[PDB]
């Protein structure tokens, strides 16, 4: 079959909804295997400074033990039959999900609905985990990458709920109480906020009923007062610089301001992002690749790795790159990046769009391989869309693409626009601002 | 760009850092007004002043390329001794090879501006010609020989006008190349600052911080010398160089330009000949001397009171032998004159250097 046959043929995803407002979504295969899990409209953009890093706290609680599975009793559950429990939390969103047999469909979708609705929270497990946290936040303080990125959202998103980390500040950590836990549970783990989505080989209609029977007690109603909605968060151009010439390589992340998840603009901008690319030392093309960022940067050894990136919030986002480099080379990487910008704005060529084209047409297919990847997207999908966008629909919005579109829309959010800089390490020769927004244009 | 652009400078430096490109535009405007005045200037003493008014009165805006030369040579002056000021209030002049420069500097554009205000050959251009070349008839045995070899003759006459449009003409172009040295060995340190520390944990870029302060200099430069140009002319001149050079007669209250009546007073304070000479040298030379009086531990005055007290006596002390310069030498301007000549070396030499050494007990080291 041609690559447009085959789009048309991938199962449309079903979705469902209970009274209680839970959505459950699945998408049916043959595979023996399969995925489910529950994600959330909770993280740090909900949360307010006294409460900042709860949800990550919650996270570290959620598999310690239920009111139905005291202590390791869930683990041993989970273990014994071979399944996979994980999690993770960003400023959007919580996940929790099971990756398991088939003909384990019912006993997953149980443990998923007793640890989001019954989880013990046990004093001394707060005390635990506390100590595991702080520890936590010392190791990812050795991650250049997890710091520089942390600031960029501080200083970029500065003064809103964004600006926060998902983990929060460690004096939240050493006073956080259950009564803090509880009630952000209480608040945010509600019916109308959840979504239980499912991929592998399972049918809708089995799904559903396992989550009719399991999650129907889930509140779905909270009332009026106490349901937690978004502000947008105001983005300013900025820059935060944290100089530490102990550190072997300097790490500089850049963005200007981003859309947004529900924004139709998302896909030109993940064209243009495409071919400016991403590379690293360990790259085989070098000096012929096609990206100009990335052959100068191989030609010319001007950084060790750089990434572009566009990091979508509901309303705002991060559009941008981030480079990794030695200290004499940084000016000249903002250099080549920036101009990379600016040509895109200004002089996109039909053959290079339609590369960056393919790129993303690989990329998304490719993304979407395996039970969890498309379990993931279900989740994630409804929580964002309110809908599961299928691929024949991804092309036609990748096909509606052309240089004249990319040339516009990278002109709307690059073009003479005020980016906010985030730097860590030997960077005494990361340019000045005014020299960076000169850049812009 | 290595000489802008990416060039890191302290992110402290004041408006006081301003005068370096003041002089460079200086210079410019000079040499351009300069030129255009060239084109219609003749060297025989029978037409130099003619041609002057020639200048003035019948060629195309004649009138303002004259003044805007005239005037700019004043705001040359005014940006010289500013700059010199700042060098010395903040101990740029550690910096040796830059100061020393700076020092060829000066006495090369007072050469330079000796010389021009000679061509249009008034009385005060054929005085000042014969006051200030005599100058060297104080070297013993020789003196006289250089003076008349410079003259080209017994007295100050034809040979002499000629030969001085020739130096005046290419002496600013030497000044050019001097200046760029001046920068070059600038460069190899970076610039000091107000502090007097190093600011090399505190750089920012050239441009676009400097390059839009040195604009604004420039505008306030230019605002100063199209006021004087456009509304006072003259305010700045002497009235005596309006008069044709008569050989035979001094006029009675003659006086140097504005910006050599300190060095003026310092030398007519002497009634000794080669006394006067080398007090008058001195007066200038002093300046490469500054390097080896410094005795405080810190570079800048800014934390030094009694440092500053005596630099501001040392201003006032200039600008009191500035007003005896255009004063008759009469009581008590006489001895008014010898006071302030004497405390100008009294506090470059004695006082200031024994006032570092004060301030360095005070503070234990
Ligand atoms: C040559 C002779 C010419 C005739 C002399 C005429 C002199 C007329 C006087 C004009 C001077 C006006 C400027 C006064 C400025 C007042 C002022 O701000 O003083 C205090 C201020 C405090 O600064 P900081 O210690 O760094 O600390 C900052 C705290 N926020 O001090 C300064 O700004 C210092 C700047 C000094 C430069 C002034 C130079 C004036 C001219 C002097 C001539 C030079 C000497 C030698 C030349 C002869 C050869
Ligand atoms: C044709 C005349 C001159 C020109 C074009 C000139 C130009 C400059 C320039 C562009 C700078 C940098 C900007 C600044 O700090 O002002 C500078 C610095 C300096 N100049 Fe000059 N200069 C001249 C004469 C002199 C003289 C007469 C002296 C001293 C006897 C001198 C001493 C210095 C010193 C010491 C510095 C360093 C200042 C600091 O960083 O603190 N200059 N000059
Ligand atoms: C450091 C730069 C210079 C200085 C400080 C300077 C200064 C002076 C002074 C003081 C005068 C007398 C003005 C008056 O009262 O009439 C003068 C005259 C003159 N200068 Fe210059 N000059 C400079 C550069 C030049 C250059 C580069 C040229 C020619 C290439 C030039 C050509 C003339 C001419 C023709 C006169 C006679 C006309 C007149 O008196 O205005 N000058 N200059
Ligand atoms: C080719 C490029 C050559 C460009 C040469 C000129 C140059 O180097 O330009 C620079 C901006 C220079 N200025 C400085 O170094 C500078 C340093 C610190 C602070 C300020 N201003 C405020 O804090 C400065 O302005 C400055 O004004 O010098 C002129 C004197 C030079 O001009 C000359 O030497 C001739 C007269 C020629
Ligand atoms: C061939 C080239 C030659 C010989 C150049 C030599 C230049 C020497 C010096 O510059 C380096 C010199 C200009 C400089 O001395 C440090 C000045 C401050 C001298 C100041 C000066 O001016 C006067 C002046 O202008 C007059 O005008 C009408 C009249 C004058 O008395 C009647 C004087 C005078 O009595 C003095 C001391
Ligand atoms: C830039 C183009 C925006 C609109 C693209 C819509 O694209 C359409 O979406 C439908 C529903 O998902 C699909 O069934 C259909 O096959 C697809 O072509
Ligand atoms: C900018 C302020 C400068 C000081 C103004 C006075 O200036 C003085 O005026 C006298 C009479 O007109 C002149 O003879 C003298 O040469 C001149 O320097
Ligand atoms: C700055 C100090 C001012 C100088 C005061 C000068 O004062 C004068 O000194 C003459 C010296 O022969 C005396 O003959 C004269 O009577 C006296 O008034």
């Keep these: ?33 399969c995925t489910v899990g529950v994600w959330i409209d909770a993280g740090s953009r909900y949360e307010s400074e006294k409460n900042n890093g709860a949800g990550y706290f919650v996270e570290h609680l959620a598999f310690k033990g239920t009111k139905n599975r005291p202590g390791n009793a869930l683990e041993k559950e989970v273990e014994s039959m071979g399944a996979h429990l994980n999690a993770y939390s960003t400023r959007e969103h919580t996940a929790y999900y099971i990756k398991a047999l088939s003909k384990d469909l019912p006993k997953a979708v149980e443990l998923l609905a007793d640890i989001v609705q019954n989880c013990s929270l046990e004093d001394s497990q707060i005390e635990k985990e506390r100590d595991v946290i702080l520890q936590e936040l010392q190791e990812n303080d050795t991650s250049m990458r997890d ?118 603009d998302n896909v030109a901008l993940q064209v243009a992002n495409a071919i400016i690319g991403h590379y690293d030392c360990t790259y085989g093309g070098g000096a012929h690749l096609s990206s100009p960022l990335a052959s100068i940067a191989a030609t010319n050894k001007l950084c060790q790795s750089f ?127 005014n020299r960076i927004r000169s850049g812009m244009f | 760009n290595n000489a802008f652009i990416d060039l890191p400078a302290p992110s402290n430096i004041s408006s006081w850092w301003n005068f370096g490109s003041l002089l460079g535009i200086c210079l410019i405007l000079q040499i351009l007004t300069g030129l255009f005045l060239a084109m219609h200037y003749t060297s025989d003493t029978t037409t130099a002043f003619s041609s002057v008014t020639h200048i003035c009165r019948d060629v195309n805006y004649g009138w303002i390329i004259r003044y805007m030369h005239a005037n700019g040579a004043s705001m040359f002056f005014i940006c010289l001794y500013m700059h010199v000021g700042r060098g010395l209030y903040y101990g740029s002049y550690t910096f040796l090879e830059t100061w020393n420069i700076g020092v060829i500097l000066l006495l090369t554009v007072m050469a330079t501006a000796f010389m021009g205000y000679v061509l249009p050959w008034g009385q005060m251009s054929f005085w000042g010609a014969t006051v200030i070349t ?41 000044i050019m190349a001097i200046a760029m040295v001046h920068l070059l060995f600038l460069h190899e340190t970076g610039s000091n600052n107000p502090t007097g520390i190093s600011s090399d944990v505190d750089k920012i870029p050239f441009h676009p911080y400097y390059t839009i302060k040195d604009i604004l200099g420039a505008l306030l430069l230019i605002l100063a010398l199209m006021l004087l140009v456009l509304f006072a002319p003259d305010l700045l001149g002497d009235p005596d160089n309006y008069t044709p050079a008569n050989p035979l007669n001094t006029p009675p209250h003659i006086k140097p330009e504005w910006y050599f009546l300190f060095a003026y007073a310092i030398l007519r304070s002497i009634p000794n000949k080669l006394g006067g000479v080398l007090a008058l040298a001195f007066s200038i030379l ?19 009171p009694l440092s500053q007290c005596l630099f501001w006596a040392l201003v006032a002390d200039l600008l009191t032998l500035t007003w005896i310069g255009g004063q008759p030498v009469e009581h008590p301007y006489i001895t008014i004159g010898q006071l302030a000549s004497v405390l100008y070396f009294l506090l470059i030499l004695v006082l200031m250097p024994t006032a570092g050494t004060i301030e360095n007990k005070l503070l234990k080291w």
């Excluded at chain 1, 048309?8 to 699945?26: F, H, I, K």
């Excluded at chain 1, 983990?167 to 950590?173: F, I, K, Y």
């Excluded at chain 2, 490469?288 to 800014?302: C, E, F, G, V, W």
Aim: aromatic letters at 10%.
């Design chain 1, 307 to 433: 990434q572009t990136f566009n990091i979508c919030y509901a309303d705002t986002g991060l559009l941008g790159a981030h480079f990794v480099c030695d200290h004499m080379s940084i000016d000249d990487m903002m250099f080549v990046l920036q101009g990379q910008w600016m040509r895109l704005c200004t002089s996109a060529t039909e053959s290079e769009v339609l590369r960056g084209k393919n790129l993303l047409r690989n990329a998304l297919v490719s993304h979407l391989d395996g039970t969890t990847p498309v379990c993931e997207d279900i989740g994630r999908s409804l929580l964002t869309y309110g809908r599961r966008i299928p691929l024949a629909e991804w092309e036609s919005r990748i096909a509606e693409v052309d240089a004249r579109v990319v040339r516009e829309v990278c002109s709307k959010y690059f073009y003479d626009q005020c980016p906010a800089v985030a730097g860590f390490g030997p960077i005494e020769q990361l340019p000045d601002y």
């Design chain 1, 1 to 33: 079959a041609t690559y447009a046959q085959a789009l048309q043929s991938v199962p449309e995803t079903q979705v469902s909804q209970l009274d209680n407002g839970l959505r459950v979504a699945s998408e049916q295969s043959s595979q023996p295997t």
């Design chain 2, 134 to 174: 005599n100058l060297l008839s104080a070297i013993p045995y020789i003196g006289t020989n250089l003076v008349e070899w410079i003259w080209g003759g017994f007295s100050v006459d034809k040979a002499t006008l000629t030969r001085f449009f020739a130096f005046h003409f290419i002496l600013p172009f030497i």
């Design chain 1, 147 to 264: 710091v520089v990125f942390n600031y960029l959202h501080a200083t970029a998103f500065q003064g809103t709920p964004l600006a926060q980390s998902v983990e929060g500040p460690s004096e939240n950590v050493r006073k956080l109480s259950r009564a803090d836990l509880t009630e952000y549970l209480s608040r945010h783990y509600k019916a109308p906020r959840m979504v239980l989505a499912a991929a592998g080989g399972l049918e809708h209609r089995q799904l559903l009923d396992l989550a009719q029977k399991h999650f129907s007690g889930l509140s779905g109603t909270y009332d009026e007062d106490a349901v937690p909605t978004l502000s947008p968060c105001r983005f300013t151009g900025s820059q935060i610089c944290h100089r530490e010439d102990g550190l072997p390589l300097a790490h500089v992340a850049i963005a200007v301001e981003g859309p947004g998840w529900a924004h139709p």
């Design chain 2, 286 to 304: 002093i300046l490469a001397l500054i390097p080896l009086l410094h005795t405080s531990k810190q570079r800048s005055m800014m934390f030094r």
